[PDB]
Amino acid sequence: SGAIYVGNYRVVNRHLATHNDWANLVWEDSSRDLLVSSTTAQGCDTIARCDCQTGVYYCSSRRKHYPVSFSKPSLIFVEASEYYPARYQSHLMLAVGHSEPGDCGGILRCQHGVVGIVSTGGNGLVGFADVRDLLWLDE
Ligand SMILES: NC(=O)[C@]12CN(C(=O)Cc3ccccc3Cl)C[C@H](C1)C2
Numbered sequence: 001s002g003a004i005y006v007g008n009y010r011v012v013n014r015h016l017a018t019h020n021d022w023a024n025l026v027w028e029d030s031s032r033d034l035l036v037s038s039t040t041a042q043g044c045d046t047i048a049r050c051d052c053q054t055g056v057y058y059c060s061s062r063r064k065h066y067p068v069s070f071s072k073p074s075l076i077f078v079e080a081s082e083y084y085p086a087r088y089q090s091h092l093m094l095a096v097g098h099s100e101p102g103d104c105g106g107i108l109r110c111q112h113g114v115v116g117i118v119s120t121g122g123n124g125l126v127g128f129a130d131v132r133d134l135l136w137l138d139e
């Protein structure tokens, strides 16, 4: 679990979104595993606007933060799950690091702010759904 709160927006993994999120839906993309909903309260997370390939992510299955080198956002095949059939997830960044299903929603940050959230993993790898291209989150 986990979310990004910037201005009047809440960014979550689309597979973990609540009824409130869908009843206050701004944007959603199943190929990205992202859902953005409107909030009443003002959010303060700064989103990074960069091409960083190093950062730190929160791993709730270890209750620790981890420094990672990660790939550039791309189309990466994701094995069929209960939430989605077998498909290529877009805007996904991989890194060598620990992850477990309850880890989805873990924030990845660089020096410029929020890069993205944990969305995939397994076999000693962790995937992050990128949010730096979503320029409308600040306007
Ligand atoms: N992005 C997806 O299609 C999902 C991918 N998901 C996993 O990769 C689950 C997972 C397995 C082992 C280690 C880590 C993780 Cl996160 C779970 C949910 C469907 C999100």
Ligand SMILES: [Zn+2]
Binding pocket: 048, 049, 050, 051, 052, 110, 111, 112, 113
């Ligand atoms: Zn950066």
